[PDB]
Each structure stands twice: as structure tokens, then as C-alpha cells.
């Protein structure tokens, strides 16, 4: 962050999680839109077990909305549109708990 | 029957909240309420 004049953009772990449904994905979409609006940028998602881990079988037996946020982030990182000049840095202990997609 | 006569303060449930701030506010509100009159004694029942 301190040596590169790109435009660092932070995101903690438990910060894209919002109680109201969908507000945990509109935030990610706005994040990437702001990044695209800001030219060369780098995002350092800090401990990312939060919006991560592995998809759990749904129902009333596990978390699902965090799963939708993870899906939104995944799609925006590599989806129908090819993001240009945006780079992401993800740091998180326990590499073996993340999902097979991220 | 003692020189209190002020007993009632129907149970105590409204002090339930989701943060300590609202509980402190309600408890000082009731404490001032008790301070309003002669020795006031607060029923605390109706808890689950």
C-alpha cells in the first residue's frame, strides 16, 4: 500500500456481511464499480475466511447469505465481463477451508 | 404495610434490549423514578 501509487482499497473480513438480504452483494458490486472508476487499483481483502469457506448444503442448517456474497465476488472477479487493471490480494489463515472456486 | 406503600412496579421485562446502552438508559430512568418518592421498592418478577 505504501510503495505503490495505484489506489489501495481495503476490505476487512466481516465487513461485506450485511443483515439485510442483498446488501451483502450490492456492496461488492459497488466496490468493483468504484475500482473501475479509479483506474489502477489493488484490493487487499484481509482475513477472508469470513466471505469464503466452502458452500454448505442449504436449508435451515447453515449460512447462505454469506454464500451469496461469496458468489457475487466470484462472478465479479471472473465473469461475463473481463475486469481490466484491477488486482486483488487475499490473505487468510487456514488455506484448506476456503472454497474450491476462490 | 410498612412505611413504603409504594410497592408495585409491575414486574421487569422492558429492560431487555440488544445493547447495554438502552438498558442503562431504562435502569437510570427507573432509578430516578424510585428517587421520585419515599422508599420505593421495585418488583423484579415476570422473568422467564
Amino acid at each position: 500500500a505504501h510503495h505503490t501509487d495505484c489506489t489501495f482499497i481495503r476490505v476487512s473480513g466481516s465487513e461485506l456481511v450485511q443483515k439485510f438480504i442483498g446488501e451483502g452483494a450490492r456492496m461488492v458490486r459497488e466496490l468493483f464499480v468504484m475500482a473501475r472508476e479509479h483506474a489502477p487499483s489493488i484490493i487487499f481483502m484481509d482475513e477472508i475466511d469470513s466471505i469464503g469457506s466452502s458452500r454448505l448444503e442449504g436449508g435451515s442448517g447453515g449460512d447462505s447469505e454469506v454464500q451469496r456474497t461469496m458468489l457475487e465476488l466470484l462472478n465479479q472477479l471472473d465473469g461475463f465481463e473481463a475486469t481490466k487493471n484491477i488486482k486483488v490480494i487475499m490473505a487468510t489463515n487456514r488455506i484448506d477451508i476456503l472454497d474450491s472456486a476462490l | 404495610s410498612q412505611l413504603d406503600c409504594n410497592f408495585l412496579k409491575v414486574v421487569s421485562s422492558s429492560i431487555v434490549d440488544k445493547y447495554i446502552g438502552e438498558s442503562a438508559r431504562l435502569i437510570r430512568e427507573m432509578f430516578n423514578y424510585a428517587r421520585d418518592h419515599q422508599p420505593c421498592i421495585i418488583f423484579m418478577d415476570e422473568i422467564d
Binding site: 466481516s14 465487513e15 443483515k19 454448505l56 442448517g61 447453515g62 487456514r94 | 440488544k18 447495554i20 446502552g21
Partner: protein, 139 residues
């Protein structure tokens, strides 16, 4: 015009009018712990130049560790009373709330208030619920 800072509705910060009533003399002879907690919190704050002149970057976090009742909370109240900076005490139970995300929001807001109210000392007491291992949850 610009009005004074406001919006301190959820003000858990003591900031006078709720301070505990204990000096460093209602605690009975916890000499080693008293000295250590002082040198951890109180000393770095007043005699700041006493530290940089050695290149230390004083400690930023201290734990409490003892049997079920030994004065842990009492020394916390005492440090809070004999202090110059703010003090916010939030038990490690008001964090396990119902609506999802509303949990970590409380931590973020607590630290934001701490940073926005000058030097501060944050006390998380009885934090034994949310500290326990990893146990990668499959649930």
C-alpha cells in the same frame, strides 16, 4: 456553520458520571499484577517519552487469567477510574446477537468510537465465549 461533533447515541463510553468507585487501594496486595498492568497501560500514556528513548513501541494488549473470582474485574474498574483516557467496557456476551452480521458490526463500531474519542482503553471482560479454537465449522 459547523456544529460540535454529535451522534454519540450508543455511548457505552464512561466519560464521567458513571465512573467506578475504587482507587488503587481497595485491592488487597496484588503487587506483581498491579505493577505489570500499570506498566502495560498506565505507564505508556503519561511518561511516553520514557519509552521512545529506548525504542519499545509499548505493549498494546493485556490479558487477565485466574480462577473464578480473584479481582480481575475489580482491577479493571480501578484502572478505569485512575486514568486520563477514555474507557469502554463491553462484555464478551453482548456480541453473540441474533441478526447475522450485527455481531461484527458491534466490534467495528466499538473500535471506531475508541479511535474517534482520543486515547482510549477498551475492556472486553469475560471473553471466553468467542475465543475458543477454530474447529472448522461444517454447520
Amino acid at each position: 456553520d459547523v456544529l460540535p461533533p454529535e451522534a454519540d447515541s450508543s455511548i457505552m463510553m464512561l466519560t464521567s458520571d458513571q465512573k467506578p468507585d475504587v482507587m488503587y487501594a481497595d485491592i488487597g496486595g496484588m503487587d506483581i499484577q498491579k505493577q505489570e498492568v500499570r506498566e502495560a497501560v498506565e505507564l505508556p500514556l503519561t511518561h511516553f517519552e520514557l519509552y521512545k528513548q529506548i525504542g519499545i513501541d509499548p505493549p498494546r494488549g493485556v490479558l487477565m487469567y485466574g480462577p473464578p473470582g480473584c479481582g480481575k474485574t475489580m482491577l479493571a474498574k480501578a484502572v478505569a477510574h485512575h486514568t486520563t483516557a477514555a474507557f469502554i467496557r463491553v462484555v464478551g456476551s453482548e456480541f453473540v446477537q441474533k441478526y447475522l452480521g450485527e455481531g461484527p458490526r458491534m466490534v467495528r463500531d466499538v473500535f471506531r468510537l475508541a479511535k474517534e474519542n482520543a486515547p482510549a482503553i477498551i475492556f472486553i471482560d469475560e471473553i471466553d465465549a468467542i475465543a475458543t479454537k477454530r474447529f472448522d465449522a461444517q454447520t
